[PDB]
Amino acid sequence: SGFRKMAFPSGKVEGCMVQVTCGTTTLNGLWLDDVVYCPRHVICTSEDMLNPNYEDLLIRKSNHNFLVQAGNVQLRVIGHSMQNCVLKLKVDTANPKTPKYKFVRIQPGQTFSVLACYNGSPSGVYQCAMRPNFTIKGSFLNGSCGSVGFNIDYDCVSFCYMHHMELPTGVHAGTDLEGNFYGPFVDRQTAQAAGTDTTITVNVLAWLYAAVINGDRWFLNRFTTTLNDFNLVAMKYNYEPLTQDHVDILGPLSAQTGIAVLDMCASLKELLQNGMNGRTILGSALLEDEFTPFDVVRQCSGVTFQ
């Protein structure tokens, strides 16, 4: 028992981090086979970033412009190319530590693990979710660009996130590993608003099933409710609509615990409408939404990866 914000084992990814240096700029890159992936604003200079023409800035540059460092070993660029917002440097050496991987583009509500990096050396790993507004509340400092988010399935690393920029409010924006931003943000240094967020409802219900699996039960009641009456209350508390699909996803969690999904909904209703009165759920005084129903199944059962 116990429940923790748990991140995938980061080993498979650590073997792919490199330092990428163009001009006066230095950021992180992801090295898979003979290709290194990094943000395209590695080619921006300082007085560029206000409105740069990347296509144009890149045709000015040559291969020897890109200092790629793989540990203390200088990797040789033999080609470059842009793809949406990511740069791709093709190098002479293939990375022998290349795991079986995939590039996947995730939906808001999905969680992943971030390996925060500086000069291609890992600093830490932590668990994030993609917020309904395509921001993520990460922990990133200068030089953290090109750190990646990922999920691990058996022996496969699903890459889903690369880091690019910090938004005035201190949240973070980034791209998939083909270079398409999440949300409406751009790698230009003009004003950009995150957009108002909501609470990932399906996930708070998943976390309440984790609590019940763990002996916390003070919050279940006899009351039931309907999706409609439940979605009318969520909106006031600015949660996200619960679909027929979320009810379905939460099926095995309901079956493991004997609480009908819609019974757990009327329990969240009462929580939003009455607070917590000093009580806490899984060691938390807030309603917690960065756990998927997949996260709860995996942690509360014992699924590993090879």
Add this chain to the structure above:
Amino acid sequence: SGFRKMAFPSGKVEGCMVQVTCGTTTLNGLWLDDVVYCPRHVICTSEDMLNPNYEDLLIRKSNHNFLVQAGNVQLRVIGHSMQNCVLKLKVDTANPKTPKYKFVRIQPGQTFSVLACYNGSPSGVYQCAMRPNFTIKGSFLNGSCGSVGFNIDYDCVSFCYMHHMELPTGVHAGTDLEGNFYGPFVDRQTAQAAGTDTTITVNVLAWLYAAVINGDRWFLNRFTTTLNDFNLVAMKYNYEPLTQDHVDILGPLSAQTGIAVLDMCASLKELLQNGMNGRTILGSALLEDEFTPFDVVRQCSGVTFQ
């Protein structure tokens, strides 16, 4: 910016996990050089664990009794020996992935990272602290024994924890990597109480400096106080005494933020005495104590490891 419960990159440790199987039992082992480390209750059977004589049970056993699995590769035991509560199997092969490491025994209040494992395959990594009562609030299921806690410094893995047992209340107990339990617990299946816990005070002050570094400021005041008057209030709220040493440790954090340590103390005082009134600190509705002053410096500056 941003602040997260951050765990060390787990790569160096993942290269050392193996499956260890004696009799009907299967648990995790730590493989460093030609030695594999695991709990000594791998040699207990089911009707033993109520009051077993380990010294005696181990002289009954031979080398071929211990099935050690290093991936899909069977490691050959050529010797065994007990050391307090840990078993040590000497094997024919040296582990070529052995990082530079150390065995360290930590004080309560110190944090570390846990790689939770099942059948020698990692399942997740997460950040724990050693509670004033030598328990840890982990996330462990059946077969998680022999998972280890660790800190990483530059290129060195400081091993500080091995997992052994879950206490009725669902907290966890374990040993250092020489086999000495933290706290008064024993690898026998008789009644054992965790003992009442307190709040790691120095750490909540460290986390309040992390908040100030990050733009949360609503909780600082003009009031100051004395160690004495501050320690009189902590005790009511069942926090731990603040020593002259904690004030000293919190020195660079005070210097980075311009808030005298004792000024931040009178700010915690007021928080304990007035709650939070719906406000939250670093995305939290509770006062958070699983961050050391070293954790805050490292996360809020950008220290990596090689």
